[PDB]
């Protein structure tokens, strides 16, 4: 008796994390079922970099990681290697040698409310870009001008986060999209197929 990876808890989770605070789940010591991944739902994006989906069953990985977050459709093109933008630079950056998969699906029926669902946030400004798989969760005000800021919001001092006003009538590009990135570590390997 050897349990299976908790992929349903990741994909079929009731609520997803904000992109700035993307959630991560380590997947070790299990036997993964990738068949249930494809045809259990309809995804609007399924792209794998450096790995083959037919050979996933025939490969054994040491440490798998399932990152999850929510963004708008327009930004789904930033969850890939060597991409730039607000999401790729200040929220979730994937390395150039990414060896994994990126899945994403529309979620306007859960993550958008009439009048705007402002619970999902994203970072606008940082002093620097995010290293690959780095998470910044700080809420210190951003110094956007020559005048330093003293923990008080004001002229040229802005809060680093902003809310996605996800409405059910928005355009498909501005609608919420749940994203799941499967990273594959290679190094005793406790994951298989």
């Amino acid at each position: 008796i050897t349990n299976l990876c908790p992929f349903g808890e990741v994909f079929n989770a009731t609520r997803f994390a904000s992109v700035y605070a993307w959630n991560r789940k380590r997947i070790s010591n299990c036997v993964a079922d990738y068949s249930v991944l494809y045809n259990s739902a309809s995804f609007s994006t399924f792209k794998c970099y450096g790995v083959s989906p037919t050979k996933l069953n025939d490969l054994c990985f040491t440490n798998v990681y399932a990152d999850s977050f929510v963004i708008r459709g327009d930004e789904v093109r930033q969850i890939a290697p060597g991409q730039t933008g607000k999401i790729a630079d200040y929220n979730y950056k994937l390395p150039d040698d990414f060896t994994g998969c990126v899945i994403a699906w529309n979620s306007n029926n859960l993550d958008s409310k009439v009048g705007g669902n402002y619970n999902y946030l994203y970072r606008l400004f940082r002093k620097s870009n995010l290293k690959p798989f780095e998470r910044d969760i700080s809420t210190e005000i951003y110094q956007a001008g020559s005048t330093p800021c003293n923990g008080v919001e004001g002229f040229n001092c802005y809060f680093p986060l902003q809310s996605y006003g996800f409405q059910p009538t928005n355009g498909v590009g501005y609608q919420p999209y749940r994203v799941v990135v499967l990273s594959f570590e290679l190094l005793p390997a406790t994951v298989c197929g």
Partner: nanobody
Amino acid sequence: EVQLVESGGGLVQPGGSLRLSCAASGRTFRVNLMGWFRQAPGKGRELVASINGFDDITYYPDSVEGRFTISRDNAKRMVYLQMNSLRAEDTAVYYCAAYDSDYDGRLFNYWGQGTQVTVSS
């Protein structure tokens, strides 16, 4: 309107502990993320802790991380800050901050009156 009413917080002994609470009343916030601030006499307003209520994610600045902790009670609209091993440096006024969003999405901040806490021998 909105009003953050802060209770708890008085006089403590160095090395002691203390729990502050803050209760919001008024219009429900478009976002669930709050924080505590600390203004010492002769210093600027400092960030002590911030909690995201939509998520289970907390943020503490490097000044005080392993000593203070922030929690929330969503049903009661309460937010708490427990401080342990309090030192004389911690003497200050602690303020409540409830963040909201405008139609544009830019986040602003509602403030509470603040409660004073002093750590003297």
